[PDB]
Design an enzyme around this catalytic site. Structure first.
Site, mmCIF file in Angstrom:
data_model
loop_
_atom_site.group_PDB
_atom_site.id
_atom_site.type_symbol
_atom_site.label_atom_id
_atom_site.label_comp_id
_atom_site.label_asym_id
_atom_site.label_seq_id
_atom_site.Cartn_x
_atom_site.Cartn_y
_atom_site.Cartn_z
ATOM 1 N N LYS A 6 0.080 3.660 -2.776
ATOM 2 C CA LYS A 6 -1.094 4.515 -2.859
ATOM 3 C C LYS A 6 -0.715 5.977 -2.864
ATOM 4 O O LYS A 6 -1.484 6.798 -3.374
ATOM 5 C CB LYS A 6 -2.067 4.200 -1.710
ATOM 6 C CG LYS A 6 -2.679 2.813 -1.865
ATOM 7 C CD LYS A 6 -3.414 2.327 -0.626
ATOM 8 C CE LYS A 6 -4.184 1.081 -0.953
ATOM 9 N NZ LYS A 6 -4.329 0.180 0.214
ATOM 10 N N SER A 66 -5.894 3.319 4.091
ATOM 11 C CA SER A 66 -5.385 2.294 3.176
ATOM 12 C C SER A 66 -6.521 1.546 2.484
ATOM 13 O O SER A 66 -6.441 0.348 2.219
ATOM 14 C CB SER A 66 -4.438 1.328 3.889
ATOM 15 O OG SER A 66 -3.356 0.997 3.030
ATOM 16 N N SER A 119 1.263 -3.282 3.787
ATOM 17 C CA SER A 119 1.451 -4.647 4.226
ATOM 18 C C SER A 119 0.999 -5.574 3.115
ATOM 19 O O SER A 119 0.195 -5.205 2.256
ATOM 20 C CB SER A 119 0.695 -4.930 5.529
ATOM 21 O OG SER A 119 -0.694 -4.907 5.320
ATOM 22 N N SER A 147 0.798 -1.230 0.000
ATOM 23 C CA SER A 147 0.000 0.000 0.000
ATOM 24 C C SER A 147 0.823 1.268 0.000
ATOM 25 O O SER A 147 0.222 2.345 -0.122
ATOM 26 C CB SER A 147 -0.940 0.023 1.198
ATOM 27 O OG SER A 147 -1.967 -0.938 1.013
ATOM 28 N N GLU A 200 -5.364 -3.568 -6.841
ATOM 29 C CA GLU A 200 -5.630 -4.217 -5.569
ATOM 30 C C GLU A 200 -6.607 -5.367 -5.778
ATOM 31 O O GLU A 200 -7.587 -5.226 -6.519
ATOM 32 C CB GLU A 200 -6.227 -3.232 -4.552
ATOM 33 C CG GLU A 200 -5.320 -2.096 -4.181
ATOM 34 C CD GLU A 200 -4.209 -2.500 -3.241
ATOM 35 O OE1 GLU A 200 -4.117 -3.695 -2.896
ATOM 36 O OE2 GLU A 200 -3.410 -1.624 -2.851
#
Length: 261
Positions: free
Chosen positions: A46, A103, A210, A43, A139
């Protein structure tokens, strides 16, 4: 340096692979540990998607207020905010905030779509001079973090430099830059990672990440009270696919870095 010996020892004690890049903006000095090895971003990617949308908004002045529909089919594995707006809309600003501060994975996928796919996120990195960043997947599959797989990776050094440019430099317009900083400072997921290794008086904006292989990442801009800011990237991944997260390793790496400045 003492610091590289302590980071090596931390890494040895942890059983995994640790990557660290610190930029001290006071004197533009860098501290690197596995600085040029690739790590899965998870992440932490992002930030690049949100900053790409911000760059678009410099010309499309109203872009961030553009509503985007959240449909059930959009929901993936972790959508703490998008879940709250299924069958409704979120603005691009709200999706950027959700992707960064919570997230939210659905939010990230909407940012990627706005940019025309992962190649559009990668293109923004190249445009601001980051030749290392690569975003290949959406994702949740970008978090597979398979050893040796170069998809969806960057290096600590590259990410540190890019994060510096986005937050402290002028890769973005003034209003966009300020908005990114405000978003990072309001991150909610970072309390046990870099922040935990630093004095409580310091201001931190960060983005965690993560994934599989116990991958545990945090990238941060740090504003010490009465002192030039720092950029710190800490990447950590482990040899077992089902390893547990080790946010304590990031806190410890930050503490070791803090010892010396």
């Amino acid at each position: 340096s003492a610091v590289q010996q302590k980071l090596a020892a931390l890494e040895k004690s942890s059983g995994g692979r640790l990557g660290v890049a610190l930029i001290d903006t006071a004197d533009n000095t860098q501290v690197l540990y596995r600085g040029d090895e690739r790590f899965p971003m998870c992440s932490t990617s992002k930030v690049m998607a949100a900053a790409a949308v911000l760059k678009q908004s410099e010309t499309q002045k109203q872009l961030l207020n553009q509503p985007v529909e959240i449909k059930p089919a959009d929901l993936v594995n972790y959508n703490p905010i998008a879940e709250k707006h299924v069958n409704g809309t979120m603005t691009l600003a709200e999706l950027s905030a959700a992707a960064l501060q919570y997230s939210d994975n659905t939010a990230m996928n909407k940012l990627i779509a706005q940019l025309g796919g992962p190649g559009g996120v990668t293109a923004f990195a190249r445009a601001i001079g980051d030749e290392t960043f690569r975003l290949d997947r959406t994702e949740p599959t970008l978090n597979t973090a398979i050893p040796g797989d170069p998809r969806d990776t960057t290096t600590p050094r590259a990410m540190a430099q890019t994060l510096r440019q986005l937050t402290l430099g002028h890769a973005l317009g003034e209003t966009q830059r300020a908005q990114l900083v405000t978003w990072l400072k309001g991150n909610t997921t970072g309390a046990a990672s870099i922040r935990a290794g630093l004095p409580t008086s310091w201001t931190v904006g960060d983005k965690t990440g993560s994934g599989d292989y116990g991958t545990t990442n945090d990238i941060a801009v740090i504003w010490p009270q009465g002192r030039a800011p720092l950029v710190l990237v800490t990447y950590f991944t482990q040899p077992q696919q089902n390893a547990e997260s080790r946010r304590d390793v990031l806190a410890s790496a930050a503490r070791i870095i803090a010892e010396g400045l």
